[PDB]
Amino acid sequence: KSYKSVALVVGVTGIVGSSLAEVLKLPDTPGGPWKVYGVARRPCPVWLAKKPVEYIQCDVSDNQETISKLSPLKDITHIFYVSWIGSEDCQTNATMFKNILNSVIPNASNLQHVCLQTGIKHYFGIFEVPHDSPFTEDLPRLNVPNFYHDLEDILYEETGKNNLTWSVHRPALVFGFSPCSMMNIVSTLCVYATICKHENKALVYPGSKNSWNCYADAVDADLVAEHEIWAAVDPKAKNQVLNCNNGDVFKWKHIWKKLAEEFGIEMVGYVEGKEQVSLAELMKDKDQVWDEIVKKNNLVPTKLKEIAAFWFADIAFCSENLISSMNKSKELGFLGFRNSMKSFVSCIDKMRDYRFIPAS
Amino acid sequence: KSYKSVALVVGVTGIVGSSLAEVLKLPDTPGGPWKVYGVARRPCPVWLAKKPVEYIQCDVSDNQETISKLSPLKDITHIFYVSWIGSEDCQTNATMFKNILNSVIPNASNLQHVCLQTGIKHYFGIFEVPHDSPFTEDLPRLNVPNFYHDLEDILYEETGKNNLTWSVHRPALVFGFSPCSMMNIVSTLCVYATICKHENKALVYPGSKNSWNCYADAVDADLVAEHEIWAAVDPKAKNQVLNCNNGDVFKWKHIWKKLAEEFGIEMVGYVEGKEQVSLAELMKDKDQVWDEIVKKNNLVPTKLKEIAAFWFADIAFCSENLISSMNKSKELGFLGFRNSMKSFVSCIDKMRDYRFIPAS
Ligand SMILES: NC(=O)c1ccc[n+]([C@@H]2O[C@H](COP(=O)([O-])OP(=O)(O)OC[C@H]3O[C@@H](n4cnc5c(N)ncnc54)[C@H](O)[C@@H]3O)[C@@H](O)[C@H]2O)c1
Ligand SMILES: NC(=O)c1ccc[n+]([C@@H]2O[C@H](COP(=O)([O-])OP(=O)(O)OC[C@H]3O[C@@H](n4cnc5c(N)ncnc54)[C@H](O)[C@@H]3O)[C@@H](O)[C@H]2O)c1
């Protein structure tokens, strides 16, 4: 085992974690060759058991467990913190990140860098008075209890006194493929399309007028991974807060049409005068339908509430004015981008490839 | 005189022509070293007489004059058609472009390429029922008398039968420095700011609510020039319709504040409930004020109606939903971009540098 770099990917089953596990193993990836330790809360799921990552199940909110499991990992060079607890609680999110750092900083004598992933909520507030956009990295914090603030403060503190470099990545809405994410918009909409098709119903848009028509942006999970790796290895990027998006804008109206096409079903668009309804409510009783779809198509077994986050789709479909700028990253020399309409389709293709959702 | 490439820049005093004349002479410019013939309607203005371009005054709507002046130019390799007549007339615009091609194609035995510059009006219509955006190059023509359609048809016809390559560039709103343009938004707003400051008045925004708040985009003139050169020399880009913008989005609200800062005057933003007023009307009697400003600051002499296009500012300030996509160009490998807030300021700096508008 000789490696140039050793990553600790905290949240390896997540929407970005799961791409890192793939992107870190590519032959041309900066910093490579990489060894990958992947940490997540659950036993290694079947869809990860066949990847070359050393999987560590660990409840990282438990300080003693995290110590016992991560303290022996002396060879770590780069930490990628791509997790959250699944609520907005400032204390319980902060405990996770502190336990990672407290377990690894004293034991990894060659640690170089800590990447912290937060998000564009930094600019507009919490889900539980926004800045105007396009959002830029220098915009000051809002006066709200955003766990992103605690995570940054811990990052700055700990990396400063231990002579480590740091980065803060603030991705836009993520287009990715993990069925174990707590916020995967593409899987959520694929599950809704799949259920519609199963019930011989049209793909009816449930959201607001404004979100149907406004400009939006997103980031491919593989591009977030590329961006995080870049900041982790390229000395010019060190110690910077950095937005991450696909470089372009789209509208949900265009995405919706593509989605109906991809599932071979009829689309119903936004209907003038019709108010947003809740997708979470429309789907409240669909667990067994999901289970049946799973079994017939011999899909990777997933439970409805895990694979889909209908509530997160409801938020996206009442949001507007959230565009974020990539000028800082581009001016630092990162010119990674994706065509968002193509990235959206790539995620659909991938989830079918991996058997999370039905083919065709 | 040995040159690798010989450009004919039709509209060399224009907003993009004038950047080409600079960009073509840089040492690292693709295709270089370049010789530059620059054609425009007026005698060479003083601010161009000190550039290394062979300036040809020619009324290109006059077929016999164009023949007599351009037929002797046997060495042309690349044509850059960056002009228009200053109205929307399909016939008179088309005559200009046909006379260029009819004069040069039979006489330039090494001609390779013709670049045609049009614009994003292709997607939404004429100034005299738009597509939705983000605009992509494949969107079909609208059923309107757009002189861009005639120019393309002439381009396709003539390049096809003469085995020439072609490109169609569709820039967004141009940020540039030429004081002889018929549509220079930055100079127009600088002239308005300059007049406000002279009259001890605040920089009052005259436009619509929607345009104050909506996302907008633009292109730096130097980036259009880079893009046109790229398409003219890079075989992978050949025979393509291509949008050109800075790669990002901005809002006029943010620009306005920067503008007031740059002129050291107070800003009045959009005022809720207040309807758009016409900047052209507010400026109708300012010719002599402009003349006086010119003389005191020993500016390059310009007449108000030439340096500014208040009517074009009125259009921008009632437009929205006009964002254009750069995915095609990026997927073809062109990763040129600009920070639009910085490009806007760069244009202000440049126009002061060149003494078109007052310093400080
Ligand atoms: N669309 C998006 O998902 C999106 C967009 C912008 C920003 N973000 C932000 O990205 C950050 C990371 O979120 P994500 O969406 O990538 O995550 P996710 O919901 O895809 O993944 C959560 C990961 O964290 C792990 N995890 C959760 N609790 C744990 C515990 N107690 N012990 C060990 N592991 C635990 C899970 O096992 C999983 O691997 C968050 O701050 C989120 O708000 C996400
Ligand atoms: N903001 C912008 O200015 C902008 C944005 C998008 C697209 N466009 C498009 O770009 C194209 C070129 O316009 P522009 O704005 O670069 O031009 P401009 O108004 O800056 O320049 C016009 C140029 O054409 C020359 N010209 C005009 N009539 C002539 C004649 N009879 N003979 C010789 N020369 C003549 C002028 O001398 C000048 O050099 C147009 O189709 C325009 O609509 C412009």
XYZ file of N, CA, C and O in Angstrom, chain A residues 228-347:
480
model
N -13.700 20.157 -4.462
C -13.160 19.945 -3.139
C -11.743 19.404 -3.228
O -10.880 19.732 -2.406
N -11.528 18.533 -4.200
C -10.188 17.912 -4.374
C -9.200 19.007 -4.777
O -8.099 19.112 -4.195
N -9.615 19.837 -5.710
C -8.845 20.955 -6.209
C -8.379 21.914 -5.095
O -7.199 22.245 -4.966
N -9.313 22.277 -4.219
C -9.012 23.101 -3.118
C -8.154 22.359 -2.108
O -7.470 22.996 -1.356
N -8.265 21.047 -2.035
C -7.513 20.330 -1.094
C -6.039 20.173 -1.540
O -5.184 19.905 -0.717
N -5.760 20.272 -2.831
C -4.411 19.966 -3.293
C -3.741 21.195 -3.884
O -2.559 21.330 -3.779
N -4.489 22.087 -4.489
C -3.877 23.227 -5.191
C -3.556 24.367 -4.216
O -4.457 24.955 -3.632
N -2.254 24.641 -3.996
C -1.882 25.641 -2.997
C -2.492 26.999 -3.255
O -2.747 27.733 -2.307
N -2.775 27.331 -4.508
C -3.417 28.627 -4.798
C -4.826 28.762 -4.245
O -5.306 29.865 -4.031
N -5.497 27.651 -4.021
C -6.862 27.664 -3.498
C -6.942 27.634 -1.993
O -8.032 27.655 -1.468
N -5.819 27.551 -1.279
C -5.862 27.268 0.150
C -6.543 28.366 0.973
O -6.389 29.540 0.709
N -7.230 27.958 2.035
C -7.813 28.862 3.026
C -8.761 29.839 2.388
O -8.609 31.036 2.471
N -9.719 29.314 1.690
C -10.737 30.145 0.984
C -12.097 29.545 1.148
O -12.235 28.298 1.167
N -13.078 30.430 1.293
C -14.451 30.092 1.168
C -14.777 30.129 -0.311
O -14.457 31.130 -1.026
N -15.421 29.069 -0.795
C -15.671 28.899 -2.224
C -17.044 28.350 -2.561
O -17.360 27.226 -2.164
N -17.844 29.083 -3.360
C -19.051 28.525 -3.933
C -18.734 27.456 -4.968
O -17.677 27.453 -5.553
N -19.657 26.546 -5.173
C -19.544 25.520 -6.179
C -20.901 25.337 -6.905
O -21.830 24.808 -6.299
N -21.006 25.743 -8.173
C -22.164 25.381 -9.004
C -21.706 24.996 -10.422
O -20.502 25.093 -10.715
N -22.640 24.525 -11.239
C -22.359 24.000 -12.582
C -21.901 25.055 -13.593
O -21.368 24.720 -14.642
N -22.054 26.318 -13.233
C -21.516 27.434 -14.058
C -22.577 28.105 -14.911
O -22.271 29.057 -15.636
N -23.776 27.568 -14.906
C -24.862 28.004 -15.761
C -26.121 28.163 -14.922
O -26.077 27.988 -13.710
N -27.266 28.381 -15.590
C -28.556 28.465 -14.908
C -29.550 27.646 -15.752
O -29.300 27.345 -16.928
N -30.639 27.241 -15.114
C -31.705 26.520 -15.794
C -33.031 27.033 -15.211
O -33.032 27.863 -14.281
N -34.126 26.509 -15.745
C -35.441 26.705 -15.146
C -36.110 25.357 -14.900
O -35.958 24.424 -15.696
N -36.857 25.244 -13.806
C -37.546 23.983 -13.481
C -38.530 23.572 -14.545
O -38.693 22.412 -14.851
N -39.167 24.546 -15.181
C -40.022 24.276 -16.331
C -39.363 23.407 -17.426
O -39.983 22.440 -17.974
N -38.105 23.705 -17.725
C -37.372 22.931 -18.762
C -37.012 21.556 -18.224
O -37.028 20.543 -18.961
N -36.645 21.520 -16.950
C -36.230 20.241 -16.291
C -37.454 19.277 -16.278
O -37.343 18.074 -16.572
N -38.595 19.836 -15.894
C -39.829 19.075 -15.786
C -40.148 18.321 -17.093
O -40.462 17.147 -17.078
N -39.980 18.990 -18.217
C -40.271 18.408 -19.485
C -39.324 17.295 -19.768
O -39.726 16.253 -20.268
N -38.042 17.527 -19.526
C -37.068 16.483 -19.675
C -37.412 15.272 -18.793
O -37.302 14.119 -19.225
N -37.803 15.531 -17.551
C -38.154 14.461 -16.598
C -39.319 13.579 -17.125
O -39.266 12.342 -17.049
N -40.386 14.226 -17.571
C -41.496 13.475 -18.161
C -41.015 12.662 -19.368
O -41.267 11.452 -19.451
N -40.251 13.280 -20.265
C -39.649 12.507 -21.363
C -38.848 11.300 -20.893
O -38.988 10.216 -21.478
N -38.022 11.469 -19.863
C -37.156 10.392 -19.443
C -37.957 9.173 -18.871
O -37.451 8.030 -18.925
N -39.138 9.447 -18.301
C -40.011 8.432 -17.756
C -41.162 8.043 -18.707
O -42.007 7.241 -18.337
N -41.104 8.556 -19.932
C -42.076 8.249 -20.973
C -43.499 8.494 -20.538
O -44.356 7.712 -20.870
N -43.749 9.555 -19.782
C -45.107 9.875 -19.336
C -45.441 11.292 -19.676
O -44.570 12.083 -20.137
N -46.725 11.602 -19.520
C -47.250 12.857 -19.967
C -46.868 13.835 -18.894
O -46.808 13.480 -17.714
N -46.641 15.086 -19.279
C -46.348 16.132 -18.293
C -47.542 17.059 -18.106
O -48.172 17.411 -19.052
N -47.842 17.430 -16.874
C -48.649 18.588 -16.611
C -47.756 19.690 -15.947
O -47.312 19.561 -14.788
N -47.569 20.793 -16.670
C -46.811 21.959 -16.192
C -47.554 22.772 -15.161
O -48.618 22.378 -14.723
N -46.970 23.922 -14.780
C -47.574 24.862 -13.884
C -48.844 25.397 -14.582
O -48.828 25.651 -15.790
N -49.908 25.574 -13.810
C -51.192 25.965 -14.353
C -51.473 27.257 -13.747
O -51.546 27.364 -12.521
N -51.660 28.256 -14.606
C -51.827 29.614 -14.157
C -52.944 29.691 -13.100
O -53.991 29.112 -13.277
N -52.682 30.372 -11.993
C -53.650 30.516 -10.926
C -53.649 29.409 -9.891
O -54.206 29.584 -8.824
N -53.044 28.258 -10.201
C -53.087 27.092 -9.309
C -51.958 27.284 -8.293
O -50.848 27.643 -8.662
N -52.247 27.119 -7.004
C -51.231 27.381 -5.959
C -50.407 26.120 -5.644
O -50.844 25.002 -5.863
N -49.201 26.319 -5.126
C -48.338 25.198 -4.772
C -49.106 24.223 -3.907
O -49.752 24.637 -2.959
N -48.976 22.942 -4.193
C -49.373 21.914 -3.201
C -48.137 21.139 -2.703
O -47.132 21.069 -3.421
N -48.251 20.455 -1.561
C -47.130 19.752 -0.974
C -46.943 18.354 -1.574
O -47.790 17.467 -1.457
N -45.784 18.156 -2.205
C -45.385 16.870 -2.676
C -45.234 15.853 -1.509
O -45.609 14.684 -1.663
N -44.747 16.296 -0.350
C -44.646 15.425 0.839
C -46.025 14.849 1.211
O -46.170 13.653 1.430
N -47.037 15.699 1.178
C -48.404 15.251 1.433
C -48.922 14.337 0.338
O -49.448 13.256 0.607
N -48.725 14.691 -0.920
C -49.171 13.788 -1.970
C -48.532 12.397 -1.851
O -49.074 11.432 -2.382
N -47.364 12.293 -1.242
C -46.673 11.033 -1.215
C -46.768 10.325 0.136
O -46.196 9.250 0.300
N -47.508 10.899 1.078
C -47.493 10.402 2.441
C -47.754 8.852 2.562
O -47.290 8.232 3.528
N -48.492 8.230 1.634
C -48.923 6.833 1.840
C -48.363 5.875 0.823
O -48.957 4.830 0.519
N -47.233 6.242 0.252
C -46.754 5.548 -0.882
C -45.676 4.538 -0.529
O -45.139 3.898 -1.422
N -45.382 4.358 0.753
C -44.318 3.406 1.161
C -44.452 2.027 0.564
O -43.477 1.460 0.026
N -45.655 1.472 0.612
C -45.857 0.111 0.086
C -45.785 0.072 -1.408
O -45.284 -0.906 -1.983
N -46.307 1.124 -2.068
C -46.216 1.218 -3.533
C -44.733 1.187 -3.891
O -44.296 0.428 -4.809
N -43.937 1.952 -3.133
C -42.468 2.021 -3.400
C -41.901 0.602 -3.248
O -41.245 0.052 -4.170
N -42.238 -0.036 -2.133
C -41.753 -1.411 -1.855
C -42.036 -2.407 -2.991
O -41.193 -3.194 -3.397
N -43.200 -2.305 -3.558
C -43.631 -3.130 -4.681
C -42.860 -2.845 -5.977
O -42.529 -3.789 -6.739
N -42.579 -1.551 -6.215
C -41.829 -1.152 -7.348
C -40.419 -1.741 -7.233
O -39.870 -2.303 -8.211
N -39.857 -1.639 -6.029
C -38.542 -2.165 -5.699
C -38.436 -3.646 -6.039
O -37.504 -4.072 -6.766
N -39.388 -4.405 -5.526
C -39.382 -5.857 -5.656
C -39.521 -6.267 -7.084
O -38.630 -6.986 -7.564
N -40.570 -5.793 -7.785
C -40.727 -6.115 -9.250
C -39.543 -5.807 -10.127
O -39.306 -6.509 -11.133
N -38.860 -4.701 -9.841
C -37.791 -4.273 -10.729
C -36.470 -4.751 -10.148
O -35.388 -4.424 -10.662
N -36.565 -5.532 -9.070
C -35.388 -6.104 -8.413
C -34.333 -4.988 -8.239
O -33.125 -5.182 -8.508
N -34.810 -3.858 -7.714
C -33.992 -2.697 -7.411
C -33.231 -2.965 -6.169
O -33.594 -3.838 -5.377
N -32.179 -2.199 -5.985
C -31.540 -2.093 -4.727
C -32.619 -1.709 -3.680
O -33.444 -0.806 -3.893
N -32.704 -2.476 -2.579
C -33.851 -2.211 -1.691
C -33.683 -0.877 -0.975
O -32.648 -0.651 -0.368
N -34.666 -0.012 -1.097
C -34.636 1.260 -0.439
C -36.008 1.489 0.120
O -36.965 0.965 -0.388
N -36.070 2.249 1.181
C -37.325 2.674 1.767
C -37.585 4.034 1.295
O -36.665 4.867 1.168
N -38.854 4.310 1.093
C -39.314 5.552 0.512
C -38.712 6.778 1.159
O -38.252 7.691 0.439
N -38.757 6.827 2.488
C -38.316 8.033 3.209
C -36.828 8.230 3.156
O -36.350 9.312 3.458
N -36.100 7.195 2.805
C -34.641 7.312 2.678
C -34.211 7.797 1.308
O -33.353 8.702 1.177
N -34.771 7.166 0.300
C -34.403 7.517 -1.087
C -34.923 8.892 -1.561
O -34.255 9.575 -2.358
N -36.076 9.302 -1.048
C -36.686 10.524 -1.441
C -36.781 11.501 -0.280
O -36.981 11.128 0.881
N -36.691 12.782 -0.606
C -36.921 13.833 0.403
C -37.949 14.790 -0.122
O -37.626 15.922 -0.615
N -39.199 14.396 -0.029
C -40.260 15.208 -0.684
C -40.331 16.614 -0.158
O -40.604 17.582 -0.925
N -40.056 16.753 1.125
C -40.061 18.065 1.806
C -39.010 19.026 1.179
O -39.206 20.220 1.142
N -37.892 18.464 0.699
C -36.805 19.253 0.159
C -37.163 19.722 -1.235
O -36.868 20.854 -1.628
N -37.872 18.869 -1.965
C -38.476 19.286 -3.226
C -39.515 20.440 -3.045
O -39.524 21.389 -3.836
N -40.291 20.401 -1.953
C -41.278 21.453 -1.705
C -40.586 22.798 -1.475
O -41.027 23.851 -1.975
N -39.476 22.778 -0.726
C -38.696 23.984 -0.585
C -38.152 24.511 -1.939
O -38.201 25.712 -2.228
N -37.581 23.638 -2.756
C -36.977 24.092 -4.003
C -38.052 24.746 -4.857
O -37.811 25.720 -5.601
N -39.234 24.171 -4.773
C -40.350 24.637 -5.580
C -41.091 25.783 -4.984
O -42.108 26.192 -5.547
N -40.590 26.368 -3.903
C -41.012 27.726 -3.524
C -39.833 28.700 -3.342
O -39.983 29.723 -2.694
N -38.685 28.398 -3.957
C -37.550 29.263 -3.864
C -37.287 30.019 -5.190
O -37.586 29.544 -6.288
N -36.701 31.188 -5.050
C -36.218 31.915 -6.178
C -35.117 32.851 -5.721
O -34.947 33.081 -4.539
N -34.380 33.426 -6.666
C -33.386 34.406 -6.386
C -32.179 33.863 -5.623
O -31.582 34.586 -4.807
N -31.810 32.621 -5.867
C -30.768 31.973 -5.076
C -29.540 31.687 -5.903
O -28.696 30.888 -5.490
N -29.380 32.381 -7.039
C -28.232 32.108 -7.868
C -26.948 32.517 -7.106
O -26.880 33.577 -6.463
N -25.943 31.679 -7.237
C -24.611 31.882 -6.649
C -23.536 32.045 -7.748
O -23.696 31.555 -8.845
N -22.500 32.815 -7.461
C -21.488 33.157 -8.405
C -20.312 32.205 -8.300
O -19.828 31.911 -7.215
N -19.828 31.787 -9.446
C -18.569 31.072 -9.533
C -17.354 31.908 -9.938
O -16.294 31.359 -10.151
N -17.455 33.239 -9.924
C -16.326 34.083 -10.328
C -15.095 33.903 -9.487
O -13.996 33.801 -10.033
N -15.268 33.723 -8.198
C -14.072 33.526 -7.325
C -13.263 32.301 -7.684
O -12.023 32.375 -7.841
N -13.950 31.158 -7.893
C -13.295 29.949 -8.231
C -12.669 30.046 -9.612
O -11.539 29.603 -9.800
N -13.372 30.661 -10.556
C -12.831 30.827 -11.898
C -11.636 31.744 -11.913
O -10.674 31.456 -12.631
N -11.667 32.821 -11.114
C -10.547 33.730 -11.052
C -9.342 33.060 -10.338
O -8.207 33.398 -10.582
N -9.606 32.075 -9.510
C -8.514 31.274 -8.908
C -8.051 30.165 -9.852
O -7.149 29.418 -9.502
N -8.658 30.067 -11.041
C -8.253 29.059 -12.020
C -9.029 27.769 -12.103
O -8.651 26.870 -12.888
N -10.101 27.618 -11.339
C -10.917 26.397 -11.452
C -12.008 26.663 -12.520
O -12.958 27.474 -12.294
N -11.901 25.946 -13.638
C -12.813 26.132 -14.778
C -13.694 24.901 -15.033
O -14.303 24.818 -16.098
N -13.811 24.016 -14.022
C -14.740 22.912 -14.025
C -16.207 23.483 -14.154
O -16.504 24.524 -13.624
N -17.028 22.832 -14.933
C -18.431 23.258 -15.158
C -19.184 22.027 -15.605
O -18.541 21.036 -15.935
N -20.520 22.104 -15.646
C -21.346 21.113 -16.272
C -22.525 21.846 -16.922
O -22.982 22.885 -16.443
N -23.001 21.292 -18.019
C -24.333 21.620 -18.586
C -25.390 20.996 -17.652
O -25.503 19.749 -17.483
N -26.129 21.873 -16.971
C -27.055 21.410 -15.978
C -28.151 20.492 -16.518
O -28.563 19.562 -15.790
N -28.700 20.756 -17.691
C -29.733 19.861 -18.301
C -29.130 18.493 -18.549
O -29.694 17.467 -18.171
N -27.918 18.478 -19.096
C -27.151 17.203 -19.225
C -26.754 16.534 -17.889
O -26.813 15.306 -17.737
N -26.416 17.317 -16.883
C -26.044 16.726 -15.555
C -27.308 16.067 -14.932
O -27.213 15.019 -14.313
N -28.463 16.698 -15.106
C -29.671 16.195 -14.534
C -29.920 14.829 -15.178
O -30.178 13.828 -14.490
N -29.807 14.764 -16.495
C -30.037 13.491 -17.160
C -29.012 12.436 -16.790
O -29.363 11.247 -16.647
N -27.763 12.850 -16.661
C -26.681 11.969 -16.228
C -27.012 11.335 -14.894
O -26.748 10.151 -14.707
N -27.603 12.097 -13.940
C -28.008 11.529 -12.687
C -29.108 10.524 -12.841
O -29.034 9.506 -12.225
